[PDB]
Structure formats: structure tokens, C-alpha cells
Design a protein around this ligand. Structure first.
Ligand code: B12
Ligand code: B12
Ligand SMILES: Cc1ncc(COP(=O)(O)O)c(/C=N/CC[C@H](N)C(=O)O)c1O
Ligand SMILES: Cc1ncc(COP(=O)(O)O)c(/C=N\CC[C@H](N)C(=O)O)c1O
Ligand SMILES: C[C@H]1O[C@@H](n2cnc3c(N)ncnc32)[C@@H](O)[C@@H]1O
Ligand SMILES: C[C@H]1O[C@@H](n2cnc3c(N)ncnc32)[C@H](O)[C@@H]1O
Lengths: 728, 109, 728, 109
């Protein structure tokens, strides 16, 4: 009920009646293919259904403002700690094509040994609670009906409270989530016996909810010393989670490998990463690919990130990507901002649309060094697996440091992370099930003695209680807030203030950050500190240098800084006034043709300025179909006016470059008077141009239009067709 | 080293090699799945309680008390269920009671 | 005389004694392949010789700061209007890999009927003269010895004064030039007979100088209505200049087609342009390919520009580029700034290197839809030529408007440019050569009757005069300046001060410009205006909005603006203060192991903070090899102390999140007391952390270090290895 | 349209089509090069003068007089050269003078 494209999200209203919000729909949605889709003048081969409302690429303006959408689901990651601001960004992202919103959790949420409740402020992520998931799912319902296409809402099931979250997620219609028991062990040191036992249940629940599962293997890129060495391990992590999840009962089509090309330039990254990508699509046929973009080998340049991303996207197009997640170009510079999520989404769209149909024109040289390297990588993985069994299994393998090691398997440098079968978080919390163990709910993995009560209900253990919450959503206990001071209501109350002053933001309301970019002709360290002194003198505060690039050691340095604006702008204090297009102009001249006579007048030999506004090269009026009779230079006003009569013209266009003793205005007078003197004056137009002309002062000398420095053919063509139009 | 080690794999066809990969992957995981069948954890029991009608707060309390009495092997949910039936009370009441210390002697019995 | 990498290029000295300067080199230089070149850990397949001095890409730091260089010569376009400023930019561009520097001429130079002299200020380009040419070539001679690889200097021979310019470029070292007699007619309306008779001489002078020639075909992209319909015209313009140049006597290997891929997203641009590219290269085997980047379907997003540029670069890689030109990604936004040339050079390099070896793994599907279109394009082009002949040749074709028509040849829409064989600039300046016509000079094309003076000199007509300037540089007449107000020295005296104070600049010494990017939560119009007011209030003058991007209609809009900083800074008034790496910390702990006990202490159950500075996931000390015994939460202080003795820990790290009643600082004091008490205090390192911890206050409780908000493993591991060292 | 126009190419191979394209390109430029062989221009002639050791200010002036007296057909360089020989003075003497109205009588003679 609502959403009007010209009105913002009523975030306040969104936060109301969450206790009553039920999700509209369940499960993961893929995009709808659209075979041979025509948009404007083009036909696309790898497109999905267009959006109902959306913001097209800037250069879409040359093509009817078409917004072709590629076939992969597109991810953007939004999680600043204030989900209530983030909700606004989600709306921007969906307009720019994002259909998979990933909410990273407040740092260390893996460690919470149960659900948390309400809307505390997060740190480097949003604290995941029922109320917050409802806020956003509710929000994304409104945003998705508007854009016209369903959005997959996504977060994380990782940790010691996986089963708890999987339940909450499954009730609230969370569409996708990450779950990898190996993540918990390797990177959070969750006891490994507890991690694997919990996953069985977590995955069982996610299967119920028909959610997309993403794995944890991107982590091995980040923790590898040299990521181009870690591919055997990735294959192993992908395999182990994949088959575990399958045997639990999750569908092959919901199990997605999280696969990030290992390297970036100046490495030869296509060559190093492409065989990995193929080997992976081949060994893992059946399963889904979630491509995601580089973060390891990335710096403070948004340009550099973007370029590397297009190569990431290329690897995806040359192989296969079911999901293509994105990383914001500022990720390694600053906590992501609104504008950079949007950059990311546009880049993914742009690049993938650019490559529409590419695989009908390009193919892999499958035999050749590609084939050999693919065969080699597969062997390295196989050997990793054989050695895990030789050590006596997965647990022994982790205890001996086989994972997170810096070697190119089978080389072991001996610097892995060894977890201890008896150690880690929640070590000592596994409990043997008795013969009479029972759980009366849908979607329980383990041994369940239901027969001791009812033979018949074995296949639907929930019946013992006439629905668990997966059947009877009313048995869910919603908790609003547990902390009276640290919550969304207190925070929103804090900025009722802005709801009609205005100021910038990057992530939170009125947070006042802006980006400053400048070049400074000096060494980099001097440049850095000089840059801060300029930003101070522009009244910015909390000034930080966040990118330095060297142009040349001596010649100077590029510097970006972010700063705070310590005041606002009253919108209503703004003076804001209340446009013919090149094509409109061209159609006008076809209907009624327009004819011109033109000379550089007096004893002036300077020919270029006039030529500039006539030759088609730089957008002169020749471009718009105008017919031009050029009489050269030093051409007396007399002969120019006689020539307009002679030729039977619509306009005189003269140039005055020489201007000593205002001879350039003195010669406009003439043309006007001479044209009066002869009588053509009202039936013909007269524009006049010059270096020292002022478009004001030249209407003053009798003539119709004046033209100074910078005049283009668009300007003189504009004039002609609008005046002509005052008459006829 | 890689050369020496790969020698046995050097004659496998791609599908011998791929299925072998997966076969071993499977042997590495079967034992982990077995542990998941025969064992439980407080998150699993808390999650079972969520699904039976209880809050997070309430699940914590029931499960914490379930561990104190060394009853995990029966399933926190089972406890709440059996108690409900031998007091002719609702699931929702047994569990709230239990979350507050009542009925644990009866459960042990 | 020198050049030192930390001293700024001395322009004034460069400007001295120009009448004595000769080129060090003549002719064009290609890049030298370095087969299978190894740099850091990688081998490169399509690398060329490295540079002796350069700036590597940002992300090159992760790989030992290698700076691999690709096969094609790379271009950047530097032409601000003041060549003396532009030299400094050339140095920057060169360090960033640019080895072809292209100088766009002042607007309308084509219309100057002869050489101009001196150094007046250009507009939209550099006024090309012998002085300005000698200055830039002299400077480049220095900048190329610095980086250690020859740089090609390039400008334009177009216009009425072709042969005058070609002579001057021949004499003065210019390494490459644009020259297409079609450019002159079609886009500048210069008489067609004059144009082709001049091209014969021009191209001969260019042949003599072993220069690379770039043609004018790209212009047909700009003047197309729909660039994807313009291709058969393109093939035709490429042929005519190419065969013409061939028969004049230019080497195929110096004849470079100017080929820009025609489309850009959201068109299916790879699918459209890839067949053209292939067809062009198949047909013009033996000729050089000068790839150039798209400017037609471009806007004010640097991001958008940059991404389309990568697809442009993919096109080249999938086919061939002998020279790869670059477009600055600000080119639809502002006249190119220093920093955005450098972007372009980095983008070109980063993409190409990232595709190194790419064609060993991927190939064209040449049979199938690509070959069908390749063939069709070729046939359309052959029919174009047929009709030209059928029309009675070039001159009739042009008169009948065959060129610059918006139709998809042979579709003709009737909107072409028509030039008059009788007409245009320089109509009627063609003179018949007589039987006694003679020119006593080298590199003259036409009928030369030298026989009437000496049959022996027929092959060497300048012997008649004992060498022309081509043989006797000594005879060249150098003109310094013709105008004593508008020259390089007046401009230089204007900014003599700024040469120990500083300000920002975008293109010209102390021009004071900077960029400001911001998001504002309101519709784009208001956002634009609001943006202008914030810039005003920031002490910026001459403020223009240059880019507006809609995030969403209501939610907000990204604005970018340029403006001028009216102040300067003295580099002395600046207060500038005078670090261990990851590897260093890892090395220190490998060699000397380091065992820690840790706990959240007291009754506190908040565990996350401490694990977050420990688990390897977000950079906690685990990653460095620290042996960590974790005791959990609510661990009494004494327990943690006894644990440290028993385990022989080198340190205690403890967390304290609850801070009610200063209980954080208190348990800090009680740990130090207990340590002292048990007589291990000077043997042990104690670090204490938590949300309300102020390090300074922590140290005052007797502990060695305190850790607050935003602490990371690197902070903590840094203090541990530092303190332990200090301790012994 | 296009499909009709192209019928006579349909049977050509890729090699014969390339050949045809270039032989037609050369037919098209041949008359243009010819014009080159047999004609000169003010720009060509200033460029011969530049190469004979004259500034551009000089070369314009000599060519502007040569066009005036109708002798472009001989070569402005030629004119300078002949005059230098026949008065027994240096090429630049010949030219400097010619650029200011002297010896144009002698040239016509
Ligand atoms: C190159 C040049 C010449 C060339 C001529 C160029 C040619 N063939 O076209 C030569 C031929 C080299 C030349 C000669 C002289 N020139 Co002069 N020339 C210049 C110069 C450097 C460039 C101007 C130019 O072409 N700009 C490029 C175009 C794009 O700019 P624009 O002409 O202003 O055109 C734009 C706008 O004005 C507008 N526009 C212009 N005309 C029209 C007409 C219409 C209808 C419209 C709609 C728009 C329009 O749109 C255009 C594009 O946006 C300027 C100095 C300067 N930096 O401006 C002097 C300058 C104009 N000329 C000057 C002088 C003094 C001379 C000489 C007297 C010097 C001498 N020899 O003693 C001679 C006289 C020539 C003569 N007989 O008129 C002075 C004029 C001083 C004065 N106010 O009297 C100038 C200003 C130099 C100076 N500042 O001292 N010079
Ligand atoms: C999540 C949380 C909890 C969770 C904790 C779950 C867990 N496993 O940790 C639960 C939900 C368990 C919890 C319980 C309670 N909490 Co609480 N909790 C929070 C919350 C929202 C975030 C804490 C967090 O994890 N932050 C993220 C981490 C990464 O940040 P961090 O701890 O600061 O760690 C960083 C630094 O401090 C530093 N660091 C920290 N320790 C150390 C140690 C070393 C050696 C080093 C080198 C560095 C270091 O490094 C980290 C980042 O790099 C905060 C509010 C807030 N915004 O801080 C309160 C808060 C701390 N808790 C509060 C309270 C009152 C409670 C309860 C009493 C509420 C109740 N039930 O009545 C209970 C107490 C339980 C107990 N027995 O102690 C108050 C404390 C009030 C005060 N003035 O002391 C807070 C401030 C909220 C508030 N403003 O009311 N809550
Ligand atoms: C063949 C030719 N001659 C001269 C000029 C311009 O020079 P005047 O203003 O003196 O006519 C142009 C225009 N060029 C755009 C360059 C593009 N950035 C490129 O990559 O080539 C031209 O194409
Ligand atoms: C499997 C997994 N679980 C949880 C967390 C979050 O970690 P805590 O709750 O343990 O702090 C992460 C970490 N990063 C996000 C993924 C990345 N942004 C991506 O695109 O894949 C993780 O990889
Ligand atoms: C400090 C953190 O502990 C949780 N929490 C659980 N119970 C309470 C309570 N009674 N008061 C405050 N916070 C509580 C969250 O409300 C909060 O974010
Ligand atoms: C105004 C333009 O005219 C040309 N020019 C040619 N001769 C002269 C002269 N004696 N004084 C000034 N400019 C001159 C220039 O090179 C200048 O830029």
C-alpha cells in the first residue's frame, strides 16, 4: 500500500506495526530471462526482463534512455550500523538495478550464543534482530513493487547461534544467506565439533525456507599471503561445504560457491585466474556460482578498483555467474557510501550489457595451456582430499594446520591455523542424544524419536503440537526493544530536526561528509599536509586524507580528502529559476529550410571564429542542415547586405575579431542600418559574433543576437530557429 | 614434489578424476553428518524452542536449566512437551514454568 | 644537462636558447617486446621492455611494486592552450607509461594559410609553431631519457597549410602526425582539389621523416547520427587515405588507421563493434591499427567513461592495436585535467596487463555469426566503392553527398554533407605546372623539371642549392615572437611568485581549481542549487556544477562541482611531524614465539570485542602467529593472573566492556596489583581494552597499554612486539 | 535493397573480395595522385620556399607576388633560383628582393 516515485520512504511509518508485519513471499528468486529482447533500436541475447521503474546509465540518454538488465542476479552490500538510514540506500540500489541486498552483520555477531533483539547501533555492520529484519524486508517489499521486480534480502547464518538465526530467518522470509561450518572453525575459532553439528540443523532449516546458500571460501583469499596460491584449498572448502549441504537435503540449485578471482593487475590476472574459474565451473557443474569481486589487491583509487572489477566481470562472462555480487570502488578507502554502492551497481550492469552476446563471438581455447592448467588444479585438489583422509579425516586435518597455510598445495609452509578438536568457542557443548531424544518441530535434522508418541506423526513431528512456527506464524514471540536508550526510536527522535534545512551525507542522515579532490604541485608528504590546510580554510572539519597518488615525485600529487560540513542550507532560502534539443532543431530545418549568408566583415582577416560556428567539425551550424553562403574575409558590410538580398537569405552572420576603437560595434550599427536603409530589416535575422562581443551590448546596436567567447554551433542554431519562430 | 605425488592420477580420465574428487569429499563429510545425527548442542535446542513458541530469552533459560540437570540428551523441546502432558497444561505454560525453575524435579523423575 | 627525479622540470631554462636546439632523434619508435619477461613473482607473455623510472599502479605494492608495460604504444592527449604548463603534465604522463604524446592544435589551426610563429595562447588546443614544437620536443628529449624509453611526439598536419607544417615537423623531430585529405574536405570545408594536391606533398615530407601517419576516419564516428550505421563509410575513408598514402610512397608499417569502436553501453557494444574490428583488420592486413577510445557516447561520469574504456581495450586485445590511444575520463565534463590524463594512462596499462596472454586462452568464433557479419560489412563496403566509381569518382561522390549520410550504407537518407568541387576554402588556388616547373628541394612529389639544369641531379634536386633545410638544418629561419603581449614570457611573469607558495591546479599553474563531490537527499534540481550554496560557503569562487547523477528521484542526487580556491599556502607555515609492517610483526613472532592468555574479566559477559582483536577474520593477532589461550568471560582477575604464571604467558590481554562505576579502570588496577603481589609484574606485558577505555587513563592504572574503540590486531600485535623489545 | 545490390558479390571468395576492394580503392585515388603530379598550390610553393631557407613571412610574400604575376606554373622556388643565378647573387638575395617587388620584370622577361 503506497510508494510514490517523487516522495521519499516514510521510514518512521515503516517502523510502525512491525509486530504485525508478515513477509509477502518466501524463498530465493532468480531473474526472468527475456529471449531476443528489443529495447530501442537494439536486440539483446543475454538480457532479463526490464524493470518497471529505474535509473538508466548516463550515456543511456543517447539511446532513448533504455535500461537493459543482464541475466545474473546483482548484489550490493548495505550495512552501516544504522539500518534505518541504510533502507534509503537500498532504494537507490534497486533503482540502479541491484536485486540482492546483502546486510553484513555488526562485528562479531558470530559470537552471540543466541538471538539478540531490537535495534541497537551496529559497528561495521547491522546487528541482526527480528525487528530489524522486519523493518528491511517490509521496506524491500515496497521498493520491489515500485521497481517492478522482486529483491532477494540476504544476511548471515554464521556462528555459534546458527540454528537460532536460521529459524528467525526462515520465519521472516529472508531469501538468502551465508552458511559454512568451516568458516566458523577457521576464522572464528568456533569449536569444530559444535560447528559441524550445528550446520546440519542450520542447513536443514534453510532448505525448508528454500533459501539460497552462499559458502565461505572467499575468506581463504583474504587470509592467503599470496592468493594465487590458495586455489587448491578453495576447491576443498567449496567441495566440503557443497556436498555436506547436499546430503543434508539442500537443493543443488540453491547451493552457491562464493568465488572471487584471486588476483588483480599488475599480476597477469585473467591468465592466472581464468583456468581456476573453468576448473571450478567444471568440477562443480550442478552447483551455482556466486562471483564476487576482488578486495584483497585493492587500494584508495576508485578508478583502479573499477577497472579490476570489469576484468572480474569478464571472468564471469567467459565462464558463468549465477549471482554476480559487487564491491564498492571506495571499499579500501573508506566505509562505503551511498554513491559508491550505486557506482558498483551501474558498473556491473554497464559492463555486462557491454558484453551481451559475447560468447556467441568468443570461445575458450580449451585445449592449450588452459586445459593443462585446469587439469593440474583439479589434481592439486584431489591430492589435498587424499591427504585429508590419510591424516584420518577433516578434524585431524584442521588440528594439523592444513588450512590457511601459505603454501601452494601440496607445498605446506607450516603456517596454517590449527584448531583443536577439544578447543575453541563452545568447546564442551556437544551432547549425546538419548534413545528417547525428541524434537516436535518441522525441519529438524537429527535422530528424532517420534514413534514413542505417535507412529503416524514421524513424517510431520510438528503435529504433536499442532504446528511449530514454520506452520503457525502466530506462535512467534516478537520482542520490540530491550534497551530503552540505544535503539532506532531514540536515534530517529534525534533527527526529527531534519524532517527543511539540508546538508550532505555519505551514510547517515545529515552526517555532513563530502569528498575533496585536488592536485598539488609538490612532493607527496608536503602535498598531504598542504591539502589539509586548504580543506580547513574551506571550513571543513574532521579532515582526513584518504587517497594520495603520485603524478611525479617532483611535479606533484593527487590528493583526496573527506571532511565535514559544519552548517546546513535552508532549502527555501534558495533562488532557483524555472531547452531546445539538437534533434528538435534539425527537424525544424527539414520542414522549412533555412539559408544563411556569412562573412568576416570590414578589413578583418581573422577567419576561424566564424568558421568554428559553421564547420561541422566542432558542432557548427552545418551539422543542423543549415545552408551557408560564405563570402570570405575583409568583406565590407555593404556587400554582405547586398548578398543577403541577392541570395534571398534568412540571416546575416558576421564576425568581428579586430576591435581597436570599438570598430567591432561600429560595424554592427552599419549592417543593421544598411539593412534598414534597403528595407529587408524585419524580414531577415542578423546575428553578430566576435572575441570582444557581449551578447547584451549587440542587441543594443540594433541587431537581433550577439555572440562572444565560447559560442558553439548549438547556440547560433538555437537562436535562429527561436527567432524565426517569433515571426512565423 | 607435485610431480612425484600426482603420478597415480596421471592416467585418470576427467570423469575418473572428477568422481574421485567427489567420492573422497563425501568420505570426509560422512562422519561429520553422523555426529549431526547422534548429537545436539544448546543452539539446536534453543532453536527447537523458538519453533515451539518460545522467545530467545525463554529458550536460553530453558536450555541453561536443561544443561544444569544434565538432561540435554532428551531434548529441551521433549522436556517441555512431556511436562505439558503430565500436568495437563499447554506447551506454552510448561515451558514458561520450566524457564522459571518449576517442574525440574518432575522432569528428572 | 641533467634531470633529477626529485627536482621539478625547469621550464624557463627549457625556453632558453631554443634557436640552438636540434632533435636528438628522428622518426617513429615502436615498443620492444620482452618475450616471457619475469617481474616479481610473475612471467608475462605480452609485455614490452620495462621502464627505468615510473610510477607503478597503486595495487603494485602488494607485488613488490612491479610496473609491467604492454605491447602497444600508448597515447594521452595534452593540449591545454598553454604549452608551457602542458610540459609538466607530459612528465607525469610519461612516468605513468605514456610513450606517445599528442598535441591537439588551437581551434581552427587548419584555417591558417601558413605557419604561425611564437607562442600565443591557444583555445581548446596549442597553437602549433616552431618555437612551441622545439620547446616540447626538447623537453620530451629530457623526459624520455629520464624514464628510459623514447617518447613519440605527435600533432596534426590537417588544413590549408599541410605542406608548410609537414616541413616544419620534418625539420623539428616530430615523430608522428595526423594527415587525411578527406578530413580537410568533409569536416572543415576546404576545397577538395587543393586538399588532395597538398596531401601529395605533405605525405611525401612525412615519408621522408619516417613518421607514423594517423588518419581522420574517427571524425565519421562523431558526425554519425547512429555510429553503428557508419561502418561501411569508415572502411571506405580508411581505404582511400591508406592506398593514397601507400602510392605516395609511405611505408605500410607507418600507415595507421584511426579506429574507434562505434558503440557504448547500454548498446550491446562488444556484439556490435567486434565484427567491425575483425573485418577492418582482415581487410587492411599489413597496415597499422591505431585503436582509440570512445568519446561520442560519453558523459560526465568518470566511472562510466572508464568502464567503456575497458571494453574498448578488450576489443583491441581480442584483435589488434599497434598504437592504443586513451581518452581522459573527464572529457565529457571538463577540458582534461592533469590527474585524468594519468587515470587514462593507468587504466590503459592496468587493463592491458590484466589481459596479458589473454589470446592463448580465448579465441574468436570466426565461423558462425561473427564471420557472417564480417563478410556482410566487407560487401557493404565494396558496394560503397562501386557506387563511387559508378558516380565518376571521388569528386562526384562528395558533391552528391555520399559521405556523412546517416543511413546504413547502401541505405542513404539524403542528409550527407555535399562539398562543391568548385567551392570551399581555397577554391581556385590550384595552378597548372608548366614544362619548365621546378623545385630545388628534397621530398617534393610532383613533376620537377631538373633535367633543364642538370640530368645528374634529377634524383637529388637540392644539389642545385647545396642542400635544402632537409639536408642543411643550418638554413632554417627561427622566429622567436611576433606579438610582444601574447607570448609565453608574459604568462610566465604572471606566475613567477608561485615558482615557495602553493595552490591547487587542474591544468594551469596556480589556477586554483578543485573538485567537490557530495550527495544531498533531495531531487536533482534543488540538489544542484543546494550544492552551489555549500560550495559558496566553503570559500570557492567560479563554481560550476559539472555532473549530476540521480541516486533516486526522491531519495537524493550525487552532485560534482569545480571551483577555485582564492588562497595560497606557504610550505613553511606547515606543521609536519617526522612503523612496523605486517611481515615485520609476523617475522618477529616466528623467530621469538609469543604466548598470550586473555579474558573478558570480572562478571562481564560481553566477549565479542576481545575475540575481534584475536580471531583471524578481521585482522586479529592470531594472524601474526601469536599463541593465544583464551579463558572466556566473567573470568576473575586473579584467575587470569594465575593462568599467566602457570602457562608462562608473555602477556595478559583483558577486556572490560561494562564500565558502570569505573569498574573498567578498577579491574585494570587490581590486575597490576595482583601481578606485583605475585612477583611477576616486570616479566609480563599487560594490555587492557574496552569500549570506554582511554589508553592514557589505562596506563595510569599501572598496565602497559590501553585499547579503545576501533582497535585492531595490528595495534595490539604492534604493542606486544614493541614492548617486549623495550623490556629487554 | 542490400540483398539485391550484393548479388554479384555473393559468389566471390574472401580473397577475391579483398582484391576487388583494393583495386577499386586504387582506381579511385589514381586521378587524385595525378592531380598531384601536374599541379601546385600556394601551400606547396611556400613549403618549397621554407625548405630553401626562407622564413614563413618571406615565403608568403614571394608566393603572393608569384600568384600576382601569374608564374606559379614555373615554381616560386624556380623563380627565386633563376633570379639568383642570372644576377649572380645568393638564393636568399634573390628571394629577399623578390619578396619586395624587385626583379619581377626580369622574371617575366
Ligand atoms: C591567430 C591569430 C591571427 C592570424 C589570423 C587567424 C585566421 N587565419 O583566422 C594572423 C592571420 C596570424 C593574425 C594576423 C593579425 N592579427 Co591576429 N589574432 C590571432 C589570434 C591569436 C587567434 C584568434 C582566434 O582565431 N581564436 C579562435 C576562435 C575560436 O576564437 P574567436 O575568433 O574569438 O571565435 C569564437 C567566438 O568569438 C565566437 N565567434 C567569433 N566570430 C563569430 C561570428 C559569429 C557569426 C558567431 C555566431 C560567433 C563568432 O565563436 C567562436 C567559437 O566559440 C588572436 C589573439 C587571441 N588569442 O584571441 C588575434 C588578434 C585578434 N589579432 C590581432 C592583431 C593585432 C593582428 C595583426 C594586426 C597583427 C599584425 N600583423 O600586425 C594582424 C592583422 C590581420 C588582419 N588583417 O586582420 C590582435 C587584435 C588587437 C585588436 N583588438 O585590434 C589579437 C587580439 C592579438 C592581440 N591580443 O594583440 N592574427
Ligand atoms: C551486544 C551487546 C550485548 C550482548 C553481548 C554479546 C557478546 N557475546 O558479547 C548481550 C546481548 C550478551 C549484552 C548483555 C548485556 N549488556 Co550489553 N552491549 C552490547 C553492545 C550493543 C555491543 C557490544 C559489542 O559487542 N561491541 C562491538 C565490539 C567489537 O566493540 P568493543 O567491545 O568496543 O571491542 C572493541 C574495543 O573496545 C577494543 N577492545 C575491547 N576489549 C579489548 C581487549 C583487548 C585486550 C584489546 C587489545 C582491545 C579491546 O577492540 C574492539 C574493536 O577493535 C553494547 C553497546 C555498544 N555500542 O557498545 C552493549 C553494552 C556494553 N552492554 C550493556 C549492558 C548494561 C548489558 C546488560 C547489563 C543488559 C542487561 N541484560 O541488563 C547485559 C550484561 C551481561 C553481562 N553479564 O555482562 C551496556 C553497558 C553499560 C555500562 N555503562 O557499563 C552497553 C554499553 C549498552 C548500553 N549503553 O546500555 N549486551
Ligand atoms: C584529422 C584531424 N585534423 C585536425 C583536427 C583538429 O584540428 P583543427 O581544429 O586545426 O581543424 C582533427 C580533430 N581531431 C580530434 C582528435 C582525436 N582526439 C583523435 O584521437 O584523433 C582531426 O581529426
Ligand atoms: C561466512 C561469513 N560469515 C560471517 C561473516 C561476518 O562475520 P561475523 O558475524 O563473524 O563478524 C563473514 C565475513 N564477511 C562477509 C562476506 C563478504 N562480504 C562476501 O561478499 O562474501 C563471512 O564471510
Ligand atoms: C546491552 C545489550 O544487552 C541486551 N539486553 C538484554 N536484556 C536487556 C535489558 N534488560 N536491558 C538492556 N539491555 C538488554 C540488549 O538490549 C542490549 O543491546
Ligand atoms: C596577432 C597575430 O598576428 C601575427 N603577427 C604577424 N606579424 C605580426 C606583428 N608585426 N605584430 C603582431 N602580430 C603579428 C601573430 O603571430 C599574432 O599572434
Amino acid at each position: 500500500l503506497q510508494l510514490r516515485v517523487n516522495e521519499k520512504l516514510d521510514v518512521e511509518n515503516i517502523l510502525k506495526d512491525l509486530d504485525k508485519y508478515t513477509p509477502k513471499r518466501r524463498g530465493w528468486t532468480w531473474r526472468q530471462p527475456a529471449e531476443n529482447l528489443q529495447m530501442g533500436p537494439f536486440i539483446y541475447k543475454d538480457a532479463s526482463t526490464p524493470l518497471e521503474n529505474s535509473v538508466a546509465l548516463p550515456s543511456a540518454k543517447y539511446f532513448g534512455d533504455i535500461d537493459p538488465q543482464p541475466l545474473p542476479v546483482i548484489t550490493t552490500e548495505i550495512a552501516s550500523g544504522r539500518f534505518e538510514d541504510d533502507i534509503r540506500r537500498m532504494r537507490m540500489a534497486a533503482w540502479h538495478g541491484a536485486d540482492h541486498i546483502m546486510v553484513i552483520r555488526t562485528a562479531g555477531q558470530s559470537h552471540y550464543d543466541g538471538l539478540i533483539e531490537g535495534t541497537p547501533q551496529g559497528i561495521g555492520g547491522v546487528p541482526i534482530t527480528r525487528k530489524q529484519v522486519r523493518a528491511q524486508r517490509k521496506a524491500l517489499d515496497l521498493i520491489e513493487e515500485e521497481v517492478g521486480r522482486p529483491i532477494n534480502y540476504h544476511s548471515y547464518v554464521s556462528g555459534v547461534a546458527g540454528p537460532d538465526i536460521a529459524v528467525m530467518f526462515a520465519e521472516e522470509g529472508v531469501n538468502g544467506a551465508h552458511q559454512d561450518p568451516q568458516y566458523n572453525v577457521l576464522y572464528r575459532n568456533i569449536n569444530m565439533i559444535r560447528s559441524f553439528i550445528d550446520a546440519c540443523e542450520s542447513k536443514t532449516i534453510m532448505a525448508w525456507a528454500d533459501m539460497a546458500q552462499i559458502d565461505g571460501a572467499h575468506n581463504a583469499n583474504a587470509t592467503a599471503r599470496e592468493a594465487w596460491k590458495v586455489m587448491p584449498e578453495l576447491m576443498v572448502q567449496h567441495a566440503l561445504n557443497s556436498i555436506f549441504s547436499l546430503k543434508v537435503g539442500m537443493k543443488k540449485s540453491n547451493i552457491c560457491l562464493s568465488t572471487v578471482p584471486p588476483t588483480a593487475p599488475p599480476a597477469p590476472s585473467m591468465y592466472l585466474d581464468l583456468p581456476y574459474a573453468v576448473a571450478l565451473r567444471e568440477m562443480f557443474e550442478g552447483y551455482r556460482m556466486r562471483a564476487q569481486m576482488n578486495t584483497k589487491y585493492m587500494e584508495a583509487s576508485t578508478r583502479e578498483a573499477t577497472v579490476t572489477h570489469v576484468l572480474n566481470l569478464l571472468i564471469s562472462k567467459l565462464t558463468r555467474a549465477d549471482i554476480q555480487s559487487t564491491i564498492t570502488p571506495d571499499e579500501g578507502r573508506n566505509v562505503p557510501w551511498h554513491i559508491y554502492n550505486i557506482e558498483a551497481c551501474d558498473t556491473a550492469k554497464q559492463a555486462l550489457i557491454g558484453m551481451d552476446g559475447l560468447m556467441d563471438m568468443v570461445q575458450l581455447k580449451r585445449e592449450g595451456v588452459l586445459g593443462d592448467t585446469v587439469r593440474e588444479l583439479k589434481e592439486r585438489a584431489v591430492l589435498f582430499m587424499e591427504e585429508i583422509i590419510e591424516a584420518g579425516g577433516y578434524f585431524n586435518a584442521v588440528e594439523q594446520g592444513f588450512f590457511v597455510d601459505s603454501g601452494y598445495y601440496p607445498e605446506r609452509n607450516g603456517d596454517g591455523i590449527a584448531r583443536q578438536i577439544n578447543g575453541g568457542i563452545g568447546a564442551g557443548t556437544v551432547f549425546e542424544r538419548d534413545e528417547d531424544y525428541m524434537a516436535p518441530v518441522t525441519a529438524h535434522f537429527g535422530y528424532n524419536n517420534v514413534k514413542q508418541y505417535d507412529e503416524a506423526l514421524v513424517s510431520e513431528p510438528s503435529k504433536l503440537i499442532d504446528g511449530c512456527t514454520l506452520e503457525v506464524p502466530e506462535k512467534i514471540v516478537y520482542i520490540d526493544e530491550l534497551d530503552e536508550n540505544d535503539n532506532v526510536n531514540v536515534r530517529m527522535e534525534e533527527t526529527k530536526e531534519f524532517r527543511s534545512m539540508i546538508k550532505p551525507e555519505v551514510e547517515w542522515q545529515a552526517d555532513g561528509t563530502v569528498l575533496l579532490t585536488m592536485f598539488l604541485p609538490t612532493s607527496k608528504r608536503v602535498a598531504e599536509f598542504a591539502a589539509i590546510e586548504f580543506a580547513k580554510k574551506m571550513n571543513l572539519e574532521e579532515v582526513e586524507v584518504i587517497n594520495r597518488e603520485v603524478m611525479q615525485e617532483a611535479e606533484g600529487t593527487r590528493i583526496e580528502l573527506k571532511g565535514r560540513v559544519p552548517f546546513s542550507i535552508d532549502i527555501n532560502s534558495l533562488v532557483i529559476p524555472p531547452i531546445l534539443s539538437e534533434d528538435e532543431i534539425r527537424e525544424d530545418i527539414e520542414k522549412t529550410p533555412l539559408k544563411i549568408v556569412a562573412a568576416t566583415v570590414g578589413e578583418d582577416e581573422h577567419s576561424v571564429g566564424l568558421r568554428e560556428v559553421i564547420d561541422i567539425k566542432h558542432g557548427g551550424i552545418e551539422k543542423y542542415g543549415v545552408e551557408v553562403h560564405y563570402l570570405g574575409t575583409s568583406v565590407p558590410v555593404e556587400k554582405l547586405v547586398d548578398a543577403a538580398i541577392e541570395l534571398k537569405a534568412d540571416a546575416i552572420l558576421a564576425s568581428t575579431i579586430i576591435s581597436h576603437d570599438d570598430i567591432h560595434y561600429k560595424n554592427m550599427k552599419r549592417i543593421h542600418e544598411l539593412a534598414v536603409e534597403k528595407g529587408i530589416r524585419d524580414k531577415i535575422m542578423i546575428g553578430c559574433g566576435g572575441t570582444q562581443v557581449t551578447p547584451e551590448v549587440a542587441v543594443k546596436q540594433g541587431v537581433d543576437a550577439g555572440f562572444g567567447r565560447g559560442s558553439k554551433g548549438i547556440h547560433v542554431a538555437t537562436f535562429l530557429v527561436k527567432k524565426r519562430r517569433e515571426m512565423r | 614434489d607435485f610431480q612425484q605425488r600426482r603420478a597415480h592420477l596421471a592416467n585418470l580420465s576427467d570423469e575418473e578424476l572428477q568422481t574421485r574428487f567427489w567420492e573422497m569429499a563425501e568420505k570426509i563429510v560422512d562422519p561429520l553428518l553422523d555426529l549431526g545425527k547422534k548429537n545436539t548442542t544448546p543452539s539446536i535446542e534453543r532453536s527447537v524452542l523458538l519453533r515451539m513458541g518460545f522467545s530467545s530469552l525463554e529458550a536460553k533459560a530453558i536450555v541453561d536449566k536443561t544443561m544444569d540437570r544434565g538432561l540435554m540428551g532428551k531434548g529441551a523441546g521433549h522436556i517441555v512437551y512431556k511436562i505439558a502432558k503430565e500436568k495437563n497444561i499447554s506447551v506454552r505454560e510448561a515451558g514458561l514454568a520450566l524457564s522459571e525453575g518449576k517442574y525440574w524435579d518432575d522432569a528428572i523423575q
